[PDB]
């Protein structure tokens, strides 16, 4: 029997199959098999080829992706795709008319389009081009311009800027159609006085002079972008007149200082909900805006507003939660931290004050997945008191106490981690367990939660894994001060609790993180355990999430304290286990995990012989406002300046004398600037500490290009193996 | 028994003593001692104290340097010193009156001045501030503004842009007083269309990285342009501006891109100007006379001196300096002869051709002084050792009477001299650099009598007798019937029966020389003494001081023979019985780093490992003046093919055969970090693993105290590992 080797991991020799589908109605869904796009009936399982992979053989461009209009009539061909940041990019587009079997050839969508999206019904298009918004009521009709103010790196209409893209919307898009198709709401961003990060991009050998990349990026404390909201009426567009935009002013509690627009959710055809958050993320407001057919304007009755405060920490897991509106848009449901700081579901009625908790307990609700008039379906880590497990639940809207678990028992030994995808109106649902066994895709009717069929069992991957000495995962918990904190171990094949093994500590450790879970990974850690017999361990300590505010907020205004502290205490416990050679304990982490890995190696605990830190953060003034200020406040003497400076990696350099440290960073990192690792290395040199390094030309935070990804794991494997006297 | 250790190298435990004097007339010099400035009498040797080490204890500023006026009356005080490039910087200046014994506080020189200079006689000042030239006739008086066009990073008056500073003048200054103090000649640089090198500077507390921007022509890019001006300082109105008379380049230059590469005043009214075509194989020397009548300066086309070259470029790194006889009507300069050896040549203004006054299989290194009877020069004639330097004189009245002034002084200890003459050369200080400890002595020119010893380094010698120092061998091998010299730093108690690891120390750039007789205490010393590594260097094809046939071997084909030859030399060292061919490393810095890369990437088979510090990776990345000299232009009609065939990136597959360590500073304004960034990327892309280290905010020199200590420690760890050393 062969082991799970580094090549296996880098070459992706053992692939996980997936069943990713798109619900197209209350009972159909699309699925792409062999580059053929098929429609499926959910009740019966029958299918028809909707678009045959042969269809576009003579197109003249590699087609990167596709989007089909809600009403099945047209399809968008995305090509010439060029990636910008995490979510943002630009591309070329073409539209194919189905019931005509041809390409619309005039009023073509412009090249270098930054965003496109169908109205939720029919076949309208909104697109963003040169930071300006455009609308095509019909695919071959000339589009109407919505905004004229757009300017590169300065004014953003309909798309986010760098920090809203990354920290607020987790999307490039800033465009929300009304469920109807009538209204197109859009955000607008002004970065006029936001400071630029600048770095060299070397590009192909053939480029003589390096290019300097300039990106508006507010470092913690810096001037943030400002934001405006507008709603356009897409029916009354004059080919003759400029479309007129109605602005929705932020609440007064917001305009008294820096604030972010943090959520946009349409409730009815004529009601829109806007959520806002203060620059100090202590305090958010939900506005509710109704449309006046007489006026033509939108009004956010002040008395309607819902206010969300937190005194122990910040608001939300990462942001104020999403509202789930009932059909008549007169009520809605929202995840809220309860009186014991455990996150639960709340029932809100519009024009009533306060709210009602429909769930409670020492566990947390991850998400609301579907609403009907009888049932709310949600995900949570309640089952078997395991914070790292996930299940599908429904609660009777008529009787809160009548809560039933849909996923808990389907395969209790293979599946303890599910996510879900419902059809419109919630007739059917696809479940997806990620572990601890192989991933399993199942379909279900909602009427009597009966299993219709298996969609993907990963039988093939299972077969392969037979011939391989796979490692196992333990998932237990230690006790620190009469509290449970969870941990996972990727044990080597043929594990023996008598023999001593070297242990690599895998950390991320960031606010609301979770590294001990029941999901099945094939990763580097897998190779390390299978082939090199290394026990790779992860631990969720103070500040980790999904265990209520007590734990997750321990770290508030104090990054680089308990979570660092606890990665170390955890290690201690781990030597006390009779199979850990404590002379061979490494640590390593990426991004936030790298900041932590560095603070650990620099603490002097003596526990760790070595570690790697990949694209770490080194000083919180170097990271972005929205994320950093969320946990740290502002870096001023009036706020939290002291701990900002007490919490840097540079100030710990001396102790790095005690360990072999490897430091890695991509030169093109637009997120955690190479700066951060530059300052780390300088501090080390300025104090005479040897250490090892490796920079990656033109790689970003992900160091995810094929070559680079191969190279970095290779380099890191060499380092760990050397550090462990491994053959 | 102790060895020369890394800590010794880095903490400067065994200090070389020096003797740096500043000739201030024909028979006195100046010398710093307990931070006391002494004046010494050359003939007799007596000294008195010229500046008390207590004079400015109340200055409220750390003094960087001093500069005494020609006439002895005033002294300049450099403080607030801020380094820029290799020669340029800024500082504050105060002028101290010696007769009055006080600080002139009227019409002071501005903070952030870019350059200052006394006239050659008298006590005039020329300074450059905000890229404009100013002139103070008297210390206390208002300055006069000569230029008005100065403009940061665009218009340079009286100072050089980046590439002139580094590659052309080896100086920030572009001002040249006439011998009188009457005329001020300056040059002017326009970098308007010169592209910018951009990089980050991270610095300290600083939230956003700073982006640095330097006009910097890479190979083939738009070069700066140059103009030349002369001003009459005697006639400066406090009311009207200052007329600057322009001298224009010859027409054989204006056709296209050219450089002003030399400015030499011959007399009070004759200026010598050298110009060089951007294709550096042709240069014109103009001779320009003043006209008391017309004011203009005229360069008779009739009397131009023209230099061409078929086998290479003109001069060693540039056309050579002319040394005019006092009357200004003849001059001497070093010129390649019929068999391509560089000897001294006598030129008469208005007569064709020149007359060689020296010949032979060796070369003149430089012309040191000129008197009515003798010309003094340094050469490597003695013993036919190209890596030796000796001082000579030749009787102007009989070219065949040539006297060696240094050879026999101490033939054992002293085979490498430099010289410093007094104004007029009644005396000279000889300076010996090896192979023994450095020796500083003084001599009278009258009949070359030895006057006294100045520094003999006895202190150091005594300290070193306690340590197991390495010895140095210096020899040659023959390849294809040619002698190629090399040296080795050999471990103490060296035992030819034993086997040693061998580290090839490489530079190897055109006209370089790594095998000489100089005495050094450096990293290679520690490697040999403590770690018992043989550190070797080899002067192969392309190296200097041995005639054009070797030095031009590399013309338009950089990254070929100098590399091949480095490789062959290492083969030849294995052939010698004391090398363990299983442990043979290679390292170099700058041009050395590039060569070290090409070698490692040759799939030679010979090198187990190597380190490259701030290497070049492809020649288009490097500066125009330097690169276009050896390579021509990177165009299809010129030498673009070999530009393309001579990069490091293209040899990346071959590195899967070596342990490679690549190092470079982030703020390297000279060899841009770029070059390394492109190397690593090529290695990532082909799957080759390799070690690396960057240095935040270090330049080409990586010479800050911490950075310096850090890299040498790091590089030692690497070499010890590569050689399995305990
Ligand atoms: C599983 O998490 C990881 C695992 C491994 C690498 C990176 C990740 N990270 C880190 C991360 C991710 N996603 C977002 C949106 C953000 C916040 N911008 C962040 C983030 C959070 C804090 C700091 Cl200091 C820097 C960064 Cl980049 C992500 O996926
Ligand atoms: C024996 O020389 C060294 C020995 C050791 C380190 C540096 C040096 N170098 C290299 C060097 C030096 N001085 C000048 C003026 C120049 C000209 N650019 C250069 C130079 C030459 C070629 C290339 Cl590719 C790049 C550079 Cl920087 C110097 O001292
Ligand atoms: C983006 O915001 C900037 C900064 O507020 C605005 O620029 C200012 O405009 C007003 C009126 O023109 C004046 O205060 C100044 O002349 C400008 N100040 C600055 C800093 O430039 C700008 O109007 C905004 N752009 C948009 C599209 O709203
Ligand atoms: C420096 O050089 C630049 C061009 O290299 C000169 O600017 C040009 O000069 C002409 C004539 O004055 C102008 O019409 C153009 O606008 C300029 N062209 C460019 C490319 O800018 C400039 O005059 C020179 N300055 C000095 C002091 O010599
Ligand atoms: C006193 C006098 O005339 N000085 C002139 C000044 O007017 C002008 O600013 C400059 C333009 O080059 O030349 C100088
Ligand atoms: C295209 O579709 C056919 C089925 O009609 C399929 O069998 C074929 O392999 C597909 N080719 C691909 C994967 O592009
Ligand atoms: C499924 O089967 C029925 C019976 O033919 C048919 O009406 C329907 O169109 C089929 N659905 C799909 C998705 O092909
Ligand atoms: C709309 O406004 C734009 C920009 O202000 C202006 O150019 C134009 O007059 C308006 N469009 C039309 C044609 O009415
Ligand atoms: C959609 O809603 C708006 C406002 O409710 C209305 O003006 C428009 O006519 C509606 N269109 C449809 C699809 O009925
Ligand atoms: C437990 O309590 C001790 C003492 O109060 C404290 O130092 C330590 O950090 C605590 N550990 C945890 C994880 O709560
Ligand atoms: C040297 O001695 C002579 C004779 O005393 C004296 O006049 C002269 O000033 C002395 N020079 C120095 C440098 O002290
Ligand atoms: C130099 O700088 C300092 C800054 O305080 C200033 O006080 C001083 O006057 C300056 N000298 C000149 C020449 O202005
Ligand atoms: C130097 O030479 C120039 C040549 O024209 C002359 O005018 C001037 O008077 C001389 N200066 C001195 C100091 O003798
Ligand atoms: C010796 O000759 C061969 C070709 O005959 C050549 O490859 C090599 O470069 C020569 N070596 C030297 C140092 O000239
Ligand atoms: C974009 O450029 C393409 C080439 O990919 C060209 O054929 C086309 O005309 C452009 N598209 C539009 C709609 O501007």
Question: Does ligand 14 have an atom closer than 6 angstroms to the CB of B459?
Answer: no
Q: Could you tell me the strand order of the sheet in which B390-395 lies?
A: B364-370, B374-379, B390-395, B402-404
Q: Are B131 and B157 in contact (CB under 8 A)?
A: yes
CA distance A255 to A247: 14
**Three-state DSSP class for A20?**
coil
The Cα–Cα gap between B435 and B414 comes to 6
Contact status, residue A478 vs residue A487, Cβ threshold 8 Å = yes
Q: Which of A419, A387, A363 is nearest to A518 (CA)?
A: A387
Task: Let me know the angle formed at the C-alpha of A298 by A295 and A304, rounded to the nearest 5 degrees.
Answer: 125
What stretch(es) of chain A map to CATH 2.140.10.30?
16-458
For testing the chain B interface, which of A672, A711, A716, A720 should be mutated: the one with the most B CBs within 10 Å? A711
CB A273 within 8 A of CB A178: no
Cβ atoms within 10 Å of B605's Cβ, excluding its own: 10
Known catalytic residue at B203: no
Q: Which residue of B has its CA nearest to A703?
A: B684
CB contact under 8 A, A205 and B689: no
The Cα–Cα gap between B492 and B529 comes to: 6
Cβ atoms of residues A153 and A214 within 8 Å: yes
Q: Whole-angstrom Cα distance, residue B216 to residue B627?
A: 13
Separation of CA A180 and ligand 9 centre (Å) = 6
**Nearest C-alpha in B relative to A196:** B208
* Nearest one of B636, B631, B545 to B591, comparing CA atoms: B631
How is domain A16-458 classified at the architecture level of CATH?
A: 8 Propeller (2.140)
Cβ-defined contact of A198 to B209 (cutoff 8 Å):
yes
Cα separation, A698 vs A668, whole angstroms: 4
Tokens coding B609: 């490992």
Q: What's the gap in Å between B43 CA and the centre of ligand 11?
A: 10
Check A688 against B706: CB less than 8 A apart: yes
The two beta strands, B691-695 and B659-665, are: parallel
* Mutate which: B616, B650, B675, B684, vs A, most A CBs within 10 A: B684
Of A180, A232, A267, best ligand 9 pocket probe by most atoms within 8 Å of the beta carbon: A180
DSSP of A435-459: -BSS-EEEEEETTTTEEEEEEE--H
Q: How far apart are CA B424 and CA A570, in angstroms?
A: 80
Report yes or no: B703 at the A interface, CB cutoff 8 Å.
no
Q: Give the C-alpha separation, A648 to A670, whole Å.
A: 20
Give the count of beta carbons closer than 10 Å to the beta carbon of residue B677. 24
Q: Which residues of B527-542 are buried (b: 16+ CB within 10 A; e: fewer)?
A: bbbbbbbbbbbbbbbb
Q: Which of B11, B200, B705 to mutate to test the interface with A (most CBs of A within 10 A)?
A: B200
Kindly give the distance from the C-alpha atom of residue A407 to the centroid of ligand 7, in angstroms, as a whole number. 29
Would you call B684 and A711 a contact, using CB atoms and an 8 Å cutoff?
yes
**A257 φψ region: left (φ > 0), alpha (ψ -120 to 50), beta (else):** left
CA dihedral B87, B88, B91, B95 (to 10 degrees): 70
Closest by CA position to A228, among listed A349, A147, A294: A147
Q: Which two tokens stand for residue A359?
A: 């769930």
Sheet strand arrangement including A428-433: A418-422, A428-433, A440-445, A450-456
Which string of DSSP letters, residue by residue, matches B478-508? EETTEEEEEEEEEPTT--TTS-EEEEEEE--
User: Comparing C-alpha atoms, which of B134, B132, B156, B154 is closest to residue B144?
Assistant: B134
Is the CB–ligand 3 distance for residue A227 below 6 Å? Answer: no
B678 at A interface, C-beta within 8 A = yes
SS3 A504: strand
| A488/B315 Cα distance (integer angstroms) | 71
Residue B133: helix, strand or coil by DSSP?
strand
Q: Residue A199: which of B200, B618, B692 has the nearest Cβ?
A: B200
| Cα A406 from Cα A419, distance rounded (Å) | 11
Check if the beta carbon of residue B649 is closer than 8 Å to that of residue B682. Answer: yes
Q: What is the resolution of this structure in A?
A: 2.6
Instruction: Give the alpha-carbon dihedral of B490, B496, B498, B500, to 10 degrees.
Output: 30
Spatial distance between the Cα atoms of B574 and A485, rounded to a whole number of angstroms: 62
* Cβ neighbours of A680 (radius 10 Å): 31
Atom of ligand 6 nearest to the CA of A34: 13
Please tell me which of the candidates B196, B672, B684 has its beta carbon nearest to residue A707: B684
- The β-bridge relationship of strands A246-247 and A226-233 is antiparallel
Are B696 and A714 in contact (CB < 8 Å)?
Answer: no
Active site residue B191: no
Strands A501-506 and A535-539: parallel
DSSP string, A218-250: -BTTSPPPEEEEEEEESSS--SSS----EE-PP
- Between CA B502 and CA A79 the distance in angstroms is 57
CATH 3.40.50.1820 fits B1-12+466-726, yes or no: yes
For domain A1-12+467-727, the CATH superfamily is Alpha/Beta hydrolase fold, catalytic domain (3.40.50.1820)
Q: Is B432 helix (H, G, I), strand (E, B) or coil?
A: strand
Distance from CA of B127 to the nearest CA of A (A): 34
Ligand 13 pocket mutation, candidates B137, B183, B268, criterion most atoms within 8 A of CB: B268
Both ends of chain A: CA-CA distance in Å? Answer: 20
* Residue range(s) in chain B whose domain bears CATH number 2.140.10.30: 16-457
b/e per residue, A29-43, with b = 16+ CB within 10 A? bbbeeeeebbbbebe
Between CA B125 and CA B76 the distance in angstroms is 10
Place of tokens 């046939």: B549
Give, using CA atoms, the residue closest to atom 12 of ligand 5. B148
Q: What are phi and psi of A295, to 5 degrees?
A: -55, -70
Q: How far apart are the first and last CA of chain B?
A: 18
* Closest listed ligand to the CA of B670: 2
The reply to whether residue A697 touches residue B680, judged by beta carbons under 8 angstroms, is: yes
Name the token pair of A538: 């992860």
Token pair 């465009």: residue: A175
DSSP calls for A107-166? SPPPSSB-EEEE-SSSS-EEEEETTEEEEESSTTSPPEE--S--BTTTEEESB--HHIII
Place of tokens 């599908």: A392
Task: Identify the helix (H) or strand (E) that includes residue B129.
Answer: strand B125-129
Q: How far is A419 from chain B (nearest CA, A)?
A: 37
User: Angle at Cα A556 formed by Cα A555 and Cα A562, nearest 5°?
Assistant: 15
Preceding omega of B516 cis (within 30 degrees of 0): no
Residues having CB within 6 Å of any atom of ligand 9: A 180-182, 269-270
**Residue from B41, B44, B50, B427 whose mutation best tests the ligand 11 pocket (most atoms within 8 A of CB):** B41
Nearest Cα residue to B289 out of B304, B274, B306, B272: B272
Contact B250, B302 (CB under 8 A): no
3-state SS class at B65: strand
Residue with the two structure tokens 């997120």: A671
- PDB experimental method: X-ray
The ligand 11 atom at the shortest distance from the C-alpha of residue B48 is 14
- Sign, CA dihedral B310-B312-B318-B324, equals negative
For residue A354, give every residue at least 6 positions away whose Cβ sits within 8 Å of its Cβ, in sequence order, or none. Answer: none
Yes or no, beta carbons of B200 and A198 under 8 Å apart? yes
Set A178, A446, A530, A591: catalytic member = A591
Instruction: For residue B602, give both structure tokens.
Output: 């040759």
Q: What is d(CA A503, CA A537) in angstroms, rounded to the nearest whole number?
A: 7
Closest atom of ligand 5 to B239 CA is: 1
**Cβ within 8 Å, pair A685-B710:** yes
| Closest-approach residue (CA) in chain A for B680 | A697
Residue A105: CB atoms within 10 Å: 10
Nearest to B660 by CA among B686, B628, B639, B622: B686
CATH 3.40.50.1820, chain B: domain bounds: 1-12+466-726
Q: Decide if A697 and B706 are in contact by the 8 Å CB cutoff.
A: no
Report yes or no: B508 and B566 within 8 Å, Cβ to Cβ. Answer: yes
Q: What does DSSP assign to residue B460? A: H
Give, as one character, the DSSP assignment of residue B297: E
Distance from C-alpha of A71 to C-alpha of A97, rounded to nearest angstrom: 12
Long-range contacts: B134-142, Cβ < 8 Å, 24+? B135/B184, B135/B231, B135/B233, B135/B236, B136/B107, B136/B109, B137/B233, B137/B236, B139/B74, B139/B95, B139/B97, B139/B104, B139/B107, B140/B104, B140/B106, B140/B107, B141/B106, B141/B107, B142/B107, B142/B238
Active-site pick, B286, B668, B669, B699: B668
Inter-chain touch A209–B202, beta carbons under 8 Å? no
Distance of residue B543 Cα from the nearest chain A Cα, in angstroms:
28
Distance between CA atoms of residues B631 and B639, nearest Å: 7
B3-6, long-range: CB < 8 A, 24+ apart: B3/B467, B3/B468, B3/B492, B3/B529, B3/B530, B4/B467, B4/B468, B4/B469, B4/B470, B4/B521, B4/B525, B4/B526, B4/B528, B4/B529, B4/B530, B5/B526, B5/B529, B5/B530, B6/B526, B6/B530, B6/B712, B6/B713, B6/B716
Question: What is the number of the ligand closest to the CA of B700?
Answer: 2
Nearest to B407 by CA among B388, B429, B420: B388
Q: Do the bridges between strand B74-83 and strand B63-68 make them parallel or antiparallel, or are there none, so unpaired?
A: antiparallel
Dihedrals phi, psi of B724, to nearest 5 degrees: 55, 45
The CATH code of domain B16-457 reads 2.140.10.30
Q: Within the 147-206 window of chain B, which residues sit less than 8 Å (CB to CB) from chain A?
A: 195-200, 202
* Contact criterion met (CB below 8 Å) for A530 and A469: yes
Residue B458: in which H helix or E strand, if any?
A: helix B458-464
CA B192 to centroid of ligand 4, rounded, Å: 7
Atom of ligand 12 nearest to the CA of B110: 13
Q: Which of B469, B572, B460 lies closest to B525 in space, CA to CA?
A: B469
* Structure-derived torsion over alpha carbons of residues B351, B356, B357, B358, reported in degrees to the nearest 10: 170
Residues B85/B173, Cβ–Cβ less than 8 Å:
no
- Residue A92 appears among annotated catalytic residues: no
Ligand 6 pocket member A34 (CB < 6 A): yes
* Nearest-neighbour CA in chain A from B725: distance (Å): 17
From the list A675, A697, A718, which residue is nearest B681 (CB)? Answer: A697
CA separation for the pair B643, B557 (Å, rounded)? 8
The tokens describing A2, both together, are 């062969």
Probe target for ligand 3 pocket from A192, A194, A229, with the most ligand atoms within 8 Å of CB: A192
Atom 28 of ligand 1: nearest residue by CA position = A591
Q: How far apart are CA B141 and CA B106, in angstroms?
A: 7
Exactly one of A324, A344, A553, A701 is catalytic; name it: A701
**E strand residue ranges, B361-512:** 364-370, 374-379, 390-395, 402-404, 417-421, 427-432, 439-444, 450-455, 471-479, 482-490, 500-506
> Number of CB pairs < 8 Å for A and B?
115
Dihedral, CA of residue B322, residue B327, residue B329 and residue B334, to nearest 10: -20
The number of residues in chain A equals: 727
The answer to whether the CB of B189 falls within 8 A of the CB of B226 is yes
Q: Name the β-bridge partners of A93.
A: A78
Ligand nearest to the CA of A233: 9
Q: Do B593 and B616 meet the contact criterion of CB atoms below 8 Å apart?
A: yes
CB of B193 shorter than 6 A to ligand 4 = yes
């Amino acid at each position: 029997r062969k082991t799970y080797t580094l090549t296996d991991y880098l070459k992706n020799t053992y692939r996980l199959k997936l069943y990713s589908l798109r619900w197209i109605s209350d009972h159909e869904y699309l699925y792409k098999q062999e580059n053929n796009i098929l429609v499926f009936n959910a009740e019966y399982g029958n299918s028809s080829v909707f678009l045959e992979n042969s269809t576009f053989d003579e197109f003249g461009h590699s087609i990167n992706d596709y989007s089909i209009s809600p009403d099945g009539q047209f399809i968008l061909l995305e090509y010439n795709y060029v990636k910008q940041w995490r979510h943002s990019y630009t591309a070329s587009y073409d539209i194919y008319d189905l019931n005509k079997r041809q390409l619309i050839t005039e009023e073509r969508i412009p090249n270098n389009t930054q965003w496109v999206t169908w109205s939720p019904v029919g076949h309208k298009l909104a697109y963003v081009w040169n930071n300006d918004i455009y609308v095509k009521i019909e695919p071959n009709l000339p589009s109407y311009r919505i905004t004229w103010t757009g300017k590169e790196d300065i004014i953003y209409n309909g798309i986010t800027d760098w920090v809203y893209e990354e920290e607020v919307f987790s999307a490039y898009s800033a465009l929300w159609w009304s469920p109807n198709g009538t209204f197109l709401a859009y955000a607008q961003f002004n970065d006029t006085e936001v400071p630029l990060i600048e770095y060299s991009f070397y590009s192909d050998e053939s480029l003589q002079y390096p290019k300097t990349v300039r990106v508006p990026y507010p470092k913690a404390g810096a001037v943030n972008p400002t934001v405006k909201f507008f709603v356009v009426n897409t029916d009354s567009l004059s080919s003759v007149t400029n479309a007129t935009s109605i602005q929705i002013t932020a609440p007064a509690s917001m305009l008294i200082g820096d604030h972010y627009l943090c959520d946009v959710t349409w409730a009815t055809q004529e009601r829109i909900s806007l959520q806002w958050l203060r620059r100090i993320q202590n305090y958010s407001v939900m506005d509710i805006c109704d449309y006046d057919e007489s006026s033509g304007r939108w009004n956010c009755l002040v008395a309607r507003q819902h206010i969300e405060m937190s005194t122990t920490g910040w608001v939300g897991r990462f942001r104020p939660s999403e509202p789930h509106f009932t059909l008549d848009g007169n009520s809605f449901y929202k995840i809220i931290s309860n009186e014991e700081g455990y996150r639960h579901i709340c029932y809100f009625q519009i024009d009533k004050k306060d709210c009602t908790f429909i769930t409670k307990g020492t566990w947390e609700v991850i998400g609301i997945e579907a609403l009907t008039s009888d049932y709310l379906y949600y995900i949570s880590n309640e089952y078997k008191g395991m914070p790292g497990g996930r299940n599908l639940y429904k609660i009777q809207l008529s009787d809160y106490t009548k809560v039933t678990c849909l996923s808990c028992e389907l395969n209790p030994e293979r599946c303890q981690y599910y996510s879900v995808s419902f059809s419109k109106e919630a007739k059917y649902y696809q479940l997806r367990c990620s572990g601890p066994g192989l991933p399993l895709y199942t379909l279900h009717s909602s009427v009597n939660d009966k299993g219709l069929r298996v969609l993907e069992d990963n039988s093939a991957l299972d077969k392969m894994l037979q011939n391989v000495q796979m490692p196992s995962k333990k998932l237990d918990f230690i006790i620190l001060n009469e509290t449970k904190f969870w941990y996972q171990m990727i044990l080597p094949p043929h594990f023996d609790k008598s023999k001593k093994y070297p242990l690599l500590l895998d950390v991320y450790a960031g606010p609301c993180s979770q590294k001990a879970d029941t999901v099945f990974r094939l990763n580097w850690a897998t190779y390390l355990a299978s082939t090199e017999n290394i026990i790779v361990a992860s631990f969720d300590g103070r500040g980790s999430g999904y265990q209520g505010d007590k734990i997750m907020h321990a770290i508030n205004r104090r990054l680089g304290t308990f979570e660092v502290e606890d990665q170390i205490e955890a290690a201690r416990q781990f030597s006390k286990m009779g199979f850990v050679d404590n002379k061979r304990i490494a640590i390593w982490g990426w991004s936030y995990g790298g900041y932590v890995t560095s603070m650990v190696l620099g603490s002097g605990s003596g526990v760790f012989k070595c570690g790697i830190a990949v694209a770490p953060v080194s000083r919180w003034e170097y990271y972005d406002s929205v994320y950093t200020e969320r946990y740290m406040g502002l870096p001023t003497p009036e706020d939290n300046l002291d701990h900002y400076r007490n919490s840097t990696v540079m100030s710990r350099a001396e102790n790095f004398k005690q360990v072999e440290y490897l430091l890695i960073h991509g030169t093109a990192d637009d997120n955690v600037h190479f700066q951060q690792s530059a300052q780390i290395s300088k501090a080390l040199v300025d104090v005479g500490v040897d250490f090892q390094a490796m920079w990656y030309t033109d790689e970003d935070h992900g160091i995810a290009s094929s070559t680079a990804h191969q190279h970095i794991y290779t380099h890191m494997s060499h380092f760990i193996k050397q550090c462990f006297s491994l053959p």
